[PDB]
Amino acid sequence: MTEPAIITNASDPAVQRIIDVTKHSIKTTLIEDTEPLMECIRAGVQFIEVYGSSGTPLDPALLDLCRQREIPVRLIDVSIVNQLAKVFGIARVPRPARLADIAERGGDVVVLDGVKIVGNIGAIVRTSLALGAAGIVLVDSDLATIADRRLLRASRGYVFSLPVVLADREEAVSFLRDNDIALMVLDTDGDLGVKDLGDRADRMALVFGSEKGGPSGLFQEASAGTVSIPMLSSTESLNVSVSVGIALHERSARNFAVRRAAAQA
């Protein structure tokens, strides 16, 4: 065979076993696929090493980036990599963002209240980043950490690109209060049409509830108003991730302005 020397072959090299180690559960994660790896490196996550399966090209952009940052790359014979991904990285889990980080960053706050489906949560993380939100407060998500590998996968690596914070319903409302961030609650039958959302000049929190429940009462009490997305009939409802896209799309001139000024500061 004279199989290329560089390819990690033994199932028990330190690195193989180190990779088993995260899998079998340091403060380090596995991050998969070319794009998520590139967003994570961009967001400043620190990597220990990037791996690809022998037999397939590593993305030139990723390689470049990996030489750009001083991130070692190596290949592992394809057979083993079936310990899962054609490309993946071991990264150090950054320290959990906190509510303060969100206020400081400027711009709209996305609050989820009892959203628990991780595919929904991940899609929302990605939308919130892309549409210029300051950050995301997760209340009642049943997540232990944002570094959960289901959420990393679902967010396509966006979970470390803006502050995403686990908080309790109480501390969340409290935080918005003493930062003077008016919140509005998304709901069917809300008084403000979502198309009027861009009119309000200052940053705001938008609160979203789960499929079933909606948002609880704590938020419904501090609210400066309710916002509705017009639908065919008043009994229908959108997926929560879809609702988030629409509301943040309406806020985008506002949030883009904030993102652009921060980029120049």
Ligand X SMILES: C[S@@+](CC[C@H](N)C(=O)[O-])C[C@H]1O[C@@H](n2cnc3c(N)ncnc32)[C@H](O)[C@@H]1O
Q: CB-based burial of residue 88 (10 Å sphere; 0-12 exposed, 13-18 middle, 19+ buried)?
A: buried
Q: Alpha-carbon torsion 212, 243, 152, 44, what sign?
A: negative
Task: Report in angstroms how near the CB of residue 74 gets to a copy of itself at its nearest.
Answer: 25
Separation between Cα atoms, residue 170 and residue 142, nearest integer Å: 16
Query: Can you state the angle between helices 240-250 and 118-130, rounded to 10 degrees?
Result: 10
Exactly one of 80, 109, 129, 172 binds a copy of itself (CB under 8 A); that residue is 129
Nearer to ligand X, 53 or 241 (CB): 241
Task: Please give the residues from 144 up to 203 whose contact with a copy of itself meets the rule CB under 8 A.
Answer: 194
Among 120, 128, 155, 255, binds ligand X (CB under 6 A): 120
> How many residues comprise the chain?
265
Question: Parallel, antiparallel, or unpaired: how do β-strands 164-167 and 135-139 relate?
Answer: parallel
From the list 72-80, 158-166, 237-245, 254-262, the region that binds ligand X by CB under 6 A is 237-245
Q: How near is the Cβ of 231 to a copy of itself at its closest, in Å? A: 4
What are 208's strand-pairing partners? Answer: 112
Between 228 and 247, how does the x/- string for binding to a copy of itself read (CB under 8 A)? -xxxxx-xxxxx-xxxxxx-
What is 18-51 written as a DSSP string? HHHHHHT---EEEEESHHHHHHHHHHTPPEEEEE
Say whether residue 122 binds ligand X (CB under 6 A): no
Can you tell me the distance from the alpha carbon of 114 to that of 192, in angstroms, rounded to the nearest whole number? 23
The site partner of 187 among ligand X, a copy of itself, none (C-beta below 5 to 8 Å per kind) is ligand X
Using N-to-C axis directions, what is the helix angle for 60-68 and 34-43, rounded to 10°?
A: 30
- Binders of ligand X among residues 159 to 218 (CB under 6 A) are 186-188, 208-211, 214-215
Footprint of ligand X (CB under 6 A): 120, 186-188, 208-211, 214-215, 228-229, 231, 237-240, 243
Feature table: binding site for S-adenosyl-L-methionine? 156, 186, 209-211, 229-231, 238-243
Residues that bind a copy of itself (CB under 8 A): 38-39, 42, 119, 123, 126-127, 129-132, 194, 229-233, 235-239, 241-246, 249, 252, 256, 259
